[PDB]
Ligand binder design. Structure first.
Ligand SMILES: CC(=O)N[C@@H]1[C@@H](O)[C@H](O)[C@@H](CO)O[C@@H]1O
Ligand SMILES: CC(=O)N[C@@H]1[C@@H](O)[C@H](O)[C@@H](CO)O[C@@H]1O
Ligand SMILES: CC(=O)N[C@@H]1[C@@H](O)[C@H](O)[C@@H](CO)O[C@@H]1O
Ligand SMILES: [Ca+2]
Ligand SMILES: [Ca+2]
Ligand SMILES: [Ca+2]
Ligand SMILES: [Ca+2]
Ligand SMILES: [Ca+2]
Ligand SMILES: [Ca+2]
Ligand SMILES: [Ca+2]
Ligand SMILES: [Ca+2]
Ligand SMILES: [Ca+2]
Ligand SMILES: [Cl-]
Ligand SMILES: [Cl-]
Ligand SMILES: [Cl-]
Lengths: 149, 149, 149
């Protein structure tokens, strides 16, 4: 009994793992995930950057980061409005970095941005043009999370 | 060996339970669930009130119930059309009750409603502009379920 | 006690199986599955027929197959653009069969189709007005999968 049931439960666990992997794939597919492409998702809620980071962290994803013009357009299409990107110059003013680490490679700044306007701006939002504007991390913008290709 | 295998499998099970919870969260997020807000969803199928209750119950949810102006609006946008709410006066005419218990608090009746028209109307549907109308529980309207915030 | 832990484990696994089934039901509901009806899903990605087949197959579904006017309409709504159907005359030219077996019964061909045009056309796409056109299996059209009622 004991050994047999233990061996059976190991097979039961492996079967359930396979089914959940399937459930995940089907949900990503219905969410619009394209083969070999990372996918972006939003609930259309607007909130402060700190809240977006916490939310995408819970979902085991990260705040959306466009690494090139294609991804940038992909994020623009998902958000539909101004949305925070996983980019900030919180650590050293003027030096934008990915929240996942590293200096910015690709960028699509609007003319004369980033300017750390007025009281200060350390976060970044992709606007209704695909272009970027640095903005207050405390302002509320659309939460867009990113998951691996 | 055995005690070790058992412990290791219990750990695998804990990991799977969290992963499933993650799946549920990402799904709700992708479908528009806002932070600290109930999750409203529909398959866009119209049916008798009896079936909507059976359906939502099978999904471990309940028929959508607007507790305030904001929730009523949220339900309105998810539904798009006439949909039953979890409210009926099948016990005492004029005394509408939530299917989950308790007397009606917030309401948003349309002019001349509730009128328990014709042979009687004990169910409630959210209609145009988010206004309410009592209707026969036998009539078919959109099924909208709610899940806790 | 080893046996007590084994029994709890069984209960944990069974509880997980039931929760996963609920998650699958809620996902299907959210993606529009109607009671007693199979449902269709798409990620809106265009690809060759062999790829769509492989993709749906991996998800334990099949390339969408309209069995009547209602399903044809549902598939048309989901696709939004030209999409492959699980129907082909690859095995015997002129005799269309469902990828899952059996001769084609219900059809919705555009006037003058199927015509195995040019070098040949063995696949089928639902196009404008929901009508059908036989096309090369090598062409890239929208991937739409169907899942059991
Ligand atoms: C709060 C807000 O929208 N601030 C923007 C600022 O980020 C931008 O750089 C500037 C450009 O003229 O326009 C506004 O001041
Ligand atoms: C203004 C008025 O009498 N409206 C009634 C409504 O109360 C009733 O629920 C419905 C039943 O189909 O018939 C009419 O629309
Ligand atoms: C009327 C006619 O011959 N139409 C053909 C169509 O059947 C074929 O599938 C397609 C392939 O590119 O080329 C034309 O559109
Ligand atoms: Ca700063
Ligand atoms: Ca700054
Ligand atoms: Ca700025
Ligand atoms: Ca009554
Ligand atoms: Ca009544
Ligand atoms: Ca009425
Ligand atoms: Ca042929
Ligand atoms: Ca052919
Ligand atoms: Ca043709
Ligand atoms: Cl800031
Ligand atoms: Cl009634
Ligand atoms: Cl072909």
């Amino acid at each position: 009994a004991i050994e047999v049931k233990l061996a059976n439960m190991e097979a039961e666990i492996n079967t359930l793992k396979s089914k959940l992997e399937l459930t995940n794939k089907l949900h990503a597919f219905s969410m619009g995930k394209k083969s070999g492409k990372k996918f972006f998702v939003t609930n259309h809620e607007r909130m402060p950057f700190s809240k977006v980071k916490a939310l995408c962290s819970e979902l085991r994803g990260t705040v959306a980061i466009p690494r090139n013009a294609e991804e940038n357009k992909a994020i623009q299409e998902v958000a539909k409005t101004s949305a925070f990107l996983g980019i900030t110059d919180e650590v050293t003013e003027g030096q934008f970095m990915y929240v996942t680490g590293g200096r910015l490679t690709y960028s699509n700044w609007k003319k004369d941005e980033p300017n750390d306007h007025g009281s200060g701006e350390d976060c970044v939002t992709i606007v209704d043009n695909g272009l970027w504007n640095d903005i207050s991390c405390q302002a509320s913008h659309t939460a867009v999370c990113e998951f691996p290709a």
